[PDB]
Amino acid sequence: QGVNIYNISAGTSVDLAAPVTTGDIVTFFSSALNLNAGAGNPNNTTANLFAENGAYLLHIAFRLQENVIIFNSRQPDGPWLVEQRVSDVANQFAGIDGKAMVTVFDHGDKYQVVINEKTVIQYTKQISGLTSSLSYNATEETSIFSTVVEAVTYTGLA
């Protein structure tokens, strides 16, 4: 088992030293939570897990104006697949202020997404494979998270 820490600046991606596969965990830690940021474009913040070929295994997008969290997948060159949505962004982060956590458990057939202690969705995968990269995309002007998000992975668990 191993722990790897990644400091992801908004709008950048990072290659994992240890891949995230079935049974592994990744948590994105934000040192802030601004639910008063302007409207997204259309997204305020997104956190992604990528396969080796660049496919979006899991795309999580936070939209304040549409008051929704979107979950989807996409082939590197393909179009967004079947979009999953969950309403009320504020409610998902309820309980903890000034910071937040977004954890993704890779259960093989699904990705379990948890905001702080709340499981927001049991996402049935649309694309499978190990996660080799991660990204945090947003602007300094409208992101709901801190300018740098710390991603921590716990691997070798299985």
Cβ 146 to a copy of itself shortest distance, Å: 13
137 binds a copy of itself (CB under 8 A): no
Cβ 110 to a copy of itself shortest distance, Å: 11
H or E element that contains 89 = helix 89-93
25 binds a copy of itself (CB under 8 A): yes
117 binds a copy of itself (CB under 8 A): yes
User: Is 80 annotated as a binding-site member?
Assistant: yes
- Reference 128, options 49, 16, 69; nearest CA is 49
The pairing of strands 131-138 and 56-63 is unpaired
The DSSP annotation for 19-49 comes to EE-TT-EEEEEES---TTS---SS-SEEEEE
Three-state DSSP class for residue 93: helix
Q: Are 80 and 98 in contact (CB under 8 A)?
A: no
> Judged by CB under 8 A, which stretch of 75-83, 104-112, 123-131, 135-143 contacts a copy of itself?
104-112
Residue choice 12, 67, 119, 124 for contact with a copy of itself (CB under 8 A): 119
User: What are the residues binding a copy of itself (CB under 8 A)?
Assistant: 1-5, 23, 25, 27, 96, 101, 103, 105, 107, 112, 114, 116-117, 119, 152, 154, 157
